[PDB]
Design a protein around this ligand. Structure first.
Ligand SMILES: Nc1nc2nc(C(=O)N[C@H](CO)Cc3ccccc3)cnc2c(=O)[nH]1
Ligand SMILES: Nc1nc2nc(C(=O)N[C@H](CO)Cc3ccccc3)cnc2c(=O)[nH]1
Length: 263
């Protein structure tokens, strides 16, 4: 029922990854909500359950497959399926707990992790911060295998957490930010794995705040500036939506758009 987007790390190229991220965005946003040229994800309020999730089927060179489930309201990876088992992060509320019962309904074994799926929790379990976890095609290839083998005992909990961190950034964060997509394209082009620099980290950390600032803006102008970081870690001040158009690809719904107010 839910749309499926396929990607493989096997012989991945800049183009195949670009096609994948574009398709993910296409299934996440409906086209109904575009503000300052930036699409907004569907509002959770009144969103029918048959429109709530998308599925990302990840394959690798090792001939293994896992399916991630993404919530369309925030691009959040809520859980995954590998063969006869499915695993969901501890839901943040009762609504999201009910919603996930509509996922992988034919699977033999259903588990809900006792831990939530946010970076802070996953970093704790991994024993490493995002800034020390390498990203790229190699890490993703390995992440798919680690997720696949979890139910049989082959994957340590820190490895599982690290593997989620890799998947979330290379799929959800890349979907959210053209900038992060670009950073992943670079890694794929040269087949060189590397941890995300401060520009990537601060964008990830600022997605919610940027979404709200843009939506609350006065004709694009922020009431309060947002501080981002450059690749070298130096501060970059954001005063306006204009500078973000090439950077942010989609936003979480935060408030209803104000009337057009033409002159
Ligand atoms: N499973 C899963 N987890 C995710 N976790 C995060 C995440 O933890 N983001 C954090 C908290 O909102 C960003 C942040 C905000 C403010 C200060 C510091 C950091 C983001 N995206 C996902 C995601 O797509 N799938
Ligand atoms: N479906 C779903 N969504 C979740 N979202 C959050 C979360 O931290 N959301 C924040 C604040 O509302 C917004 C946000 C910020 C950055 C990236 C993604 C979402 C936490 N857990 C879940 C969860 O268990 N299932």
């Amino acid at each position: 029922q839910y749309p499926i987007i396929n990607f493989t790390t096997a012989g991945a190229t800049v183009q195949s990854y670009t096609n994948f991220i574009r398709a993910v965005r296409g299934r996440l946003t409906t086209g109904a909500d575009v503000r300052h040229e930036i699409p907004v994800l569907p509002n959770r309020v009144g969103l029918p359950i048959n429109q709530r999730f998308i599925l990302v089927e990840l394959s690798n060179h090792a001939e293994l497959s896992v399916t991630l489930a993404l919530d369309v309201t925030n691009a959040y990876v809520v859980g995954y399926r590998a063969g006869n088992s499915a695993y969901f992060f501890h839901p943040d509320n009762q609504e999201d707990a009910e919603a996930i019962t509509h996922l992988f309904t034919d699977v033999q074994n259903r588990y809900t992790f006792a831990f939530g799926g946010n970076y802070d929790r996953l970093e704790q379990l991994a024993g490493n911060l995002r800034e020390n976890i390498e990203l790229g095609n190699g890490p993703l290839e390995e992440a798919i295998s680690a997720l696949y083998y979890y139910s049989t005992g082959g994957t340590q909990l820190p490895t599982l957490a690290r593997s989620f961190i890799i998947c979330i950034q290379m799929i959800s964060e890349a979907a959210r930010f053209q900038y992060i997509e670009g950073e992943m394209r670079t890694r794929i082009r040269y087949n060189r794995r590397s941890a995300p620099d401060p520009s990537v980290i601060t964008l990830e950390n600022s997605w919610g705040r940027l979404s709200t600032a843009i939506q609350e803006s006065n004709q694009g102008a922020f009431a309060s500036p947002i501080q981002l970081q450059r690749r070298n870690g130096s501060k970059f001040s954001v005063y306006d939506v204009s500078i973000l158009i090439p950077i942010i690809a989609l936003m979480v719904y935060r408030c209803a758009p104000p009337p057009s107010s033409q002159f």
